[PDB]
Write a protein that binds this DNA or RNA. Structure first.
Length: 88
RNA sequence: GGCCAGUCUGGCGUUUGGUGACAGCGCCAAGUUCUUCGGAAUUGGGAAAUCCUACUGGCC
């Protein structure tokens, strides 16, 4: 099952072939994603899990942001995705 | 495999919408119908839907 702060690669939709971050879990089928750059948290995108590829990387920055504040900022989403690309 | 609900000429751009196929807006291209021959108007197949191919979402 998906986790808050987990990296996904979008496989369907107009934003396909981008990496994004799961920022909310609705149920086991639907989540919300955002990247803090072109898709910011105030425009988070509803996605069927079948249209994402789960990646084995959860950003601690995003996960810690939600643990301490219940939210995530656009700056932390951008930083998490940038760190993911560099390491992986 | 079965059923329900969807999408429509091809291409690419887009921090627009859509879970998605896609759509919107844009321009490029093809077919077709026009022309004042500069350029306009259109759009899967089919005479037709409770039809069909392809594709998408859900259920079994």
């Amino acid at each position: 099952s998906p986790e808050i702060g987990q990296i996904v690669k979008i496989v369907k939709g107009r934003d396909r072939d981008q990496f994004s971050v799961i920022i909310k879990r609705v149920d086991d089928r639907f989540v919300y994603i955002a990247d803090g750059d072109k898709r910011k948290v105030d425009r988070a995108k509803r996605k069927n899990m079948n249209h994402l590829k789960l990646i084995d990387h959860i950003s601690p920055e995003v996960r810690h942001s939600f643990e301490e504040t219940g939210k995530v900022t656009n700056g932390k989403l951008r930083f998490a995705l940038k760190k993911f690309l560099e390491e992986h």
